[PDB]
Design a protein around this ligand. Sequence first.
Ligand code: CLA
Ligand code: CLA
Ligand code: CLA
Ligand code: CLA
Ligand code: CLA
Ligand code: CLA
Ligand code: CLA
Ligand SMILES: CC1=C(/C=C/C(C)=C\C=C\C(C)=C\C=C\C=C(C)\C=C\C=C(C)\C=C\C2=C(C)C(=O)CCC2(C)C)C(C)(C)CCC1
Ligand SMILES: CC1=C(/C=C/C(C)=C/C=C/C(C)=C/C=C/C=C(C)/C=C/C=C(C)/C=C/C2=C(C)CCCC2(C)C)C(C)(C)CCC1
Ligand SMILES: CC1=C(C/C=C(\C)CCC[C@H](C)CCC[C@H](C)CCCC(C)C)C(=O)c2ccccc2C1=O
Lengths: 739, 102, 56, 74, 31, 134, 80, 31
Amino acid sequence: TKFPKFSQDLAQDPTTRRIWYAMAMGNDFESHDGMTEENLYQKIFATHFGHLAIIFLWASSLLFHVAWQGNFEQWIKDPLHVRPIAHAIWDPHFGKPAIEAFTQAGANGPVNIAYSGVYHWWYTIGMRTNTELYTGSVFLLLFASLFLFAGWLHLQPKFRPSLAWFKSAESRLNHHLAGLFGVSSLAWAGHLIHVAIPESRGQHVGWDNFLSTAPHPAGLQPFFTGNWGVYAQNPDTAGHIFSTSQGAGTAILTFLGGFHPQTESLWLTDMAHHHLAIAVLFIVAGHMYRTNFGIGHSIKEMMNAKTFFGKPVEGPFNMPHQGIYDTYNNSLHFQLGWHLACLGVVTSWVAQHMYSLPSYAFIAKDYTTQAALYTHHQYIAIFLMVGAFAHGAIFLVRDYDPEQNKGNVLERVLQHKEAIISHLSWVSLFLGFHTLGLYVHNDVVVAFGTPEKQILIEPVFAQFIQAAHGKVLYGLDTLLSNPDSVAYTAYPNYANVWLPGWLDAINSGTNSLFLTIGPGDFLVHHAIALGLHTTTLILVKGALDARGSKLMPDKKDFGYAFPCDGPGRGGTCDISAWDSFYLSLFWALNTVGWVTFYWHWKHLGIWQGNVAQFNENSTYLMGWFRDYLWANSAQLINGYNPYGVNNLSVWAWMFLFGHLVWATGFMFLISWRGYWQELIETLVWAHERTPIANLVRWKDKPVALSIVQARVVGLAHFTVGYVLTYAAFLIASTAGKFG
Amino acid sequence: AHGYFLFGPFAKLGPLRDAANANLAGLLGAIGLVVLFTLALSLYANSNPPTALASVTVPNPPDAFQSKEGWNNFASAFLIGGIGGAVVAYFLTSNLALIQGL
Amino acid sequence: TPFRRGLEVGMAHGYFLFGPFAKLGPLRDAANANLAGLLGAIGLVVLFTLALSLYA
Amino acid sequence: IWLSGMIFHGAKFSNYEAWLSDPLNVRPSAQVVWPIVGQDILNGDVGGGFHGIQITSGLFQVWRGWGITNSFQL
Amino acid sequence: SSISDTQVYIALVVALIPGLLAWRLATELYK
Amino acid sequence: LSGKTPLFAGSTGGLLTKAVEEEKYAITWTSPKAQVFELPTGGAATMHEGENLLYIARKEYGIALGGQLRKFKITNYKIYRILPSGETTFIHPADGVFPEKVNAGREKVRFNARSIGENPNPSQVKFSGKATYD
Amino acid sequence: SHTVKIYDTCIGCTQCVRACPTDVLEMVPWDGCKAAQVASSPRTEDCVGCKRCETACPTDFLSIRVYLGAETTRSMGLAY
Amino acid sequence: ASFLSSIFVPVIGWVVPIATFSFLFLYIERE
Ligand code: CLA
Ligand code: CLA
Ligand code: CLA
Ligand code: CLA
Ligand code: CLA
Ligand code: CLA
Ligand code: CLA
Ligand SMILES: CC1=C(/C=C/C(C)=C\C=C\C(C)=C\C=C\C=C(C)\C=C\C=C(C)\C=C\C2=C(C)C(=O)CCC2(C)C)C(C)(C)CCC1
Ligand SMILES: CC1=C(/C=C/C(C)=C/C=C/C(C)=C/C=C/C=C(C)/C=C/C=C(C)/C=C/C2=C(C)CCCC2(C)C)C(C)(C)CCC1
Ligand SMILES: CC1=C(C/C=C(\C)CCC[C@H](C)CCC[C@H](C)CCCC(C)C)C(=O)c2ccccc2C1=O
């Protein structure tokens, strides 16, 4: 039937299994029939270009609709009180009441309010007109076309890169760090200085006049001279109104270090100063390696080193890394598993900052965008983190060569993996028995009308971190809260210019910068501890046990994703390392759930000016049940009541939608195949023995979904329901109250 | 037979059933459904359909549906007759008051 | 083709049979006189088509 | 033992004798939890000067259908 | 209040250029 | 191929369209008595005193039946594979000796002289077109 | 389709052949001095893959494995 | 140019599914 074109085994399949499994392994080039290592890398390289194009085309969409169907110019004049528009609705199913409800934000038709926060990005970036967005949209289309042509080009025969070009790792670090990180960071300081910072001060700078008008009054002569202090002479005053010249200054680079008073965001002058310094280090960082000129460090030589100054050490930190370089470079799953974890951490790193240190103007007061953006990135951090171990497990199956490693660090981990998996189980058990029973003790004892008997304990040493940053509320008078301490007033160089601005922000109380933590904040971090240790326990186990176990020593021969080894020797329901991945997402989704509930309820108390309800009721779990879930769901469920319809009608429909998607998955998890195959065999009998429908007959024989497939179909249902129904609650609860 | 059958649900129960253009919506909606029904035949015909089965009630081989030609000719006639049945049902129901008014 | 023959034959007869029912049938002097001819003419076509398939 | 246990609680720890005086204002109770940690709350003012947990099995209505009017009979 | 009509058709015509190239890259990857 | 059908009224559980199109199977056995035996797909059926023959949709139905026949002390059961063109092939007791008992004429197939621990790793064998179980 | 591979730890218990629903395995004479019987898998095309052979093997780990692979009508247990 | 929504929306809901599922169903069933 020749549909797959990568596996003859699937094509020689009379059943419906071929259609599903074809969808599964179509991106799995390593499993494709007759795929050499050269063609593998070459096909992967071209695919990246098509992926990058999808990103820029998606970015072009945000600018086109906001320009064509949006209120950007209107929102700029009153950002706090005007609601941004994402795009326009056109649904023939709507009735007159629905259109009258969704006609909002001053639009002339049914329209969708925005919650991505691009309006606050595009205001801070230097854009002030719909036409400027249109140019960016058209530019990205051509910018995407540039990559799509490159992908086609690099598959042509004489332009196809060679295998050695891909494995030239020491060069790639040299260019990415210096060029992709550095120059892109250096360039961004240019736009901030030439476009954004002037536009914040009132002057209109564009392609027409950026060559003529200068950012600073003095030219570039102080830089080439070296008297760099000139650029930080006149900073923007505190009473500076954004996008105007009142209270403005001439400084392009400075280290004021605090928050802008009006926008309650970071100073753009610092962001320009910021990226410039980082680009210098990244460029400096780039020149480390051994690329063809000969001047630099060889990572392979550093890894295989066995000698310090005089002592014959086993390696770096006298640890044997004798075969880590070839391991990293030769196997792609090792790289992908590594790069995903690095990116997964950075994704959470973004989220942890953007609410505490908002960079974009007036985004802090848009309470809905601040919540959706946090919940967005953290969910993404999970998959990037959870996907990392999945590829680390795939590496140990189909790419790990024990003969090449032979006593390095990596083999040393597999030797004592029992201690790694065992001690993780103790930590996960040690946390949950104690974390839970404190919630249950407080919940019961509060239910018995004696809240004073609760086990409330203060996050002491965490407050020492906030007191270490200059928070006076706790009164510890530690580093940077004591004015006499050496860190507050640096003895050699009294150059802590960040101090007057930082202390004003952290000690304000209005912003979300290092908010107050109480006993309720304590227990939840240990719940978060339990999630992250246990997710690791599952994933670490499957990876290390992917190659073998006492139950199934020959697991590597079968592969990463196999269903089972049958019922023999006690039962082998879930042995594959794919199953460890499979059980982990059920946790990892819950971990951010525990986080996002903690982020949301803590902030709703602050935005509404009611901090006591969280600090008091967060201890007992009925508080999370009553004060957060029950109370905040009132406006959502009333989105479409029998007394009319309001703006929050999609969310209620989406709320019940994700509930249904969450549940239909459970069928594929609970109910397994053998029941369904027998059921389908009866339908085959009837269709073959019914009078008139006997004319029509399947070409591919219908069969029940495979065991691994139903696990795939079931978890997506678990996840899609999990994601959607909380987004509706997160947005509707926040939007209806507006904090 | 099917165009005459499919006109009813769209008209008396679809949107605009309580309007002046109710019966017209049934005719257009039915034709759009007949076209999809016609398209389905062409795909099942142009995909090398295996065979037609013979059961007890139809003991002999049923018909010459054993090839692409038999199903393709079936599809062309479905659109012709299918649209005809709906157009018939429209003129009767729209002018049923007149036919009784005679 | 056999289908093309009957269409040419039927289009003639359908166009012919409208006349007697309209002008000379009942309700010939009324607003709906021409409408009665359309129904009666189609009636014979159904009966005529029945005899054709029946004879077939 | 179960069935005999239910009617026994109705005999010793209950308000059935008082419930017959006013079945519309006194709620039925036959369970009493001891004054130990925080759980005396469950013995609220169920009615009839008795502090106990309110019952929903309906044994009180059955005994009235059986014509039982005093505790010693139960 | 919104982009002019003529600018919309221009961006729409421009979108064909990624489309023809996306089709070319995609069919080439199949081969 | 010869024999008598077991006497039963019929059953939906049985032969389907696959038999006409591809590879129907058959099973033959001979019994001295005429007992009642459960069929492979539901129901019960009697068996004649000589040369019983039954058509089955798969090979698993026959050996499952043959195991039931061994309860009645019947050990001469032969399974065939009837193709749509009428080609029949004698399969299950491929030699006169049953599979569980040894016969000299047979040869070992898909035998690995090594133990499972001695098999190579997958990384040692990738892009070659060979598997670890070889 | 599903490959059935036998290893040298066989001891001629014959418990694998008796468990086969489809008669895939057949004992054969071991020419060496181990025993007069060692298993084989001639009719591997009919391997449905129910792993009954593995549950019946008395070794520490198996003398006979069943590595799943491509599917067919005979392997998927389809009577239609 | 709000009329474009009346032409481009149903193309995504009706024309694109019909054309894609039509070709794919024939492609997967080819021999
Ligand atoms: C019968 C129920 C129903 C139906 C059929 C629709 C239909 C629609 N609504 Mg809608 N809506 C409904 C109820 C319904 N609504 C209700 C109850 C509400 C609440 C009052 C709304 C509120 C609402 C809003 C607010 C909006 C819509 C919009 C839309 C349109 C989206 C069209 C589009 O972009 O392409 C289809 C959309 C897709 C996302 C594609 C499918 C996505 C799948 C999951 C992934 C795609 C890959 C796929 C799996 C692979 C196979 C496909 C192959 C071709 C590759 C569409 C006409 C939007 C609109 O006006 O159109 C722009 C819009 O903004 N609706
Ligand atoms: C970002 C980099 C990246 C890359 C390059 C890959 C690449 C790969 N992964 Mg991987 N992965 C990643 C991230 C990545 N993944 C992440 C972040 C995770 C964690 C979730 C995983 C988890 C993962 C697992 C568990 C496995 C892979 C596998 C694979 C390989 C096969 C892919 C496949 O089967 O086709 C893709 C097939 C699909 C069916 C993908 C689409 C399915 C989505 C989930 C459908 C969602 C439904 C719908 C669209 C939503 C509707 C919305 C509703 C409201 C209407 C391939 C090499 C597999 C393998 O065997 O590796 C060799 C394998 O077992 N990966
Ligand atoms: C015993 C049953 C029976 C019945 C119920 C009728 C009924 C009728 N005959 Mg009739 N007829 C019968 C037996 C019967 N006939 C027999 C046995 C003979 C032979 C002698 C005749 C000879 C005869 C003649 C010669 C005429 C009639 C006419 C009529 C109609 C005149 C009504 C009127 O007042 O003016 C008219 C009132 C109207 C409301 C207009 C009527 C419009 C027609 C009947 C609509 C028919 C549509 C039809 C069902 C389409 C068929 C297709 C369908 C099978 C799928 C009436 C419907 C007269 C006529 O012209 O009818 C059109 C006429 O000229 N009949
Ligand atoms: C995403 C794209 C999309 C779009 C644009 C539409 C659009 C429409 N849907 Mg729809 N639908 C969709 C997806 C979509 N649907 C999906 C995915 C589902 C599955 C849940 C549905 C389920 C659905 C139902 C169940 C119903 C609709 C109906 C309708 C129509 C209501 C219009 C109105 O106000 O009342 C009607 C106003 C009128 C003026 C009469 C409409 C006349 C029709 C639309 C004419 C169509 C002509 C046809 C295409 C002719 C083709 C012939 C040619 C090929 C030769 C409208 C045309 C309703 C309907 O009855 O439409 C007929 C209806 O009952 N839809
Ligand atoms: C200066 C030279 C240079 C440059 C600019 C690049 C650039 C790139 N190469 Mg490349 N390459 C080079 C030299 C270079 N390479 C050399 C010499 C070799 C041979 C040794 C290669 C071999 C090579 C391969 C084999 C591949 C690439 C790939 C890529 C792309 C990576 C994906 C991407 O866009 O990441 C973008 C990344 C960034 C912009 C920065 C890092 C990400 C951080 C997290 C963002 C910054 C933080 C900030 C807060 C984000 C804010 C966002 C804002 C919107 C708010 C990228 C376009 C890959 C690709 O995509 O294929 C086309 C690929 O497969 N290159
Ligand atoms: C609310 C539901 C829930 C709960 C409570 C747990 C709890 C647990 N899971 Mg888990 N799990 C769940 C849902 C849940 N899971 C779901 C939906 C999935 C997806 C399939 C998984 C997948 C999963 C995997 C894959 C793994 C776990 C693991 C664990 C354990 C981790 C150790 C720990 O945190 O110690 C805290 C433990 C508790 C809080 C439970 C202790 C029980 C109570 C508090 C005390 C018992 C006294 C009792 C009340 C009195 C007896 C009364 C009498 C009638 C008998 C723990 C037992 C991991 C594990 O076991 O490794 C150690 C592991 O590997 N689970
Ligand atoms: C499954 C239950 C169900 C039922 C019964 C209905 C019923 C209806 N829907 Mg609806 N709908 C449903 C689920 C259902 N919906 C779901 C799940 C959604 C969410 C996507 C919607 C979304 C929706 C929208 C958005 C709209 C409707 C509309 C309608 C109405 C018009 C139906 C129409 O035009 O179809 C035409 C139907 C056909 C052409 C096929 C009819 C099949 C017949 C009845 C088969 C009979 C078989 C026969 C008895 C057996 C033969 C035996 C033989 C031997 C003789 C009607 C009241 C429209 C409306 O305005 O409502 C008033 C409309 O616009 N629906
Ligand atoms: C040469 C050269 C020099 C001359 C330099 C001069 C004279 C000009 C330099 C021009 C350059 C190099 C400009 C950079 C152009 C790239 C731009 C302007 C755009 C990047 C946009 C991106 C990537 C996408 C942005 C997006 C879009 C489009 C949006 O609409 C919203 C934001 C976001 C989504 C991010 C000097 C004398 C120094 C030294 C000698 C050599
Ligand atoms: C009693 C009974 C029954 C019932 C029946 C029924 C219910 C029926 C159906 C009905 C139907 C379902 C009907 C339908 C019909 C239809 C028709 C009547 C058609 C028409 C057509 C036409 C006339 C057309 C024509 C045309 C064409 C084709 C083309 C062009 C145009 C025109 C229009 C000319 C049954 C069998 C079930 C069972 C047994 C008993
Ligand atoms: C219902 C069910 C079935 C039977 C399910 C079948 C046959 C699937 C039928 C679904 C049809 C194909 C419609 C699905 C359409 C989807 C909405 C879209 C899928 C198309 C994507 C490729 C876009 C199993 O085979 C099974 C196996 C193992 C554990 C649990 C189960 C199980 O629960």
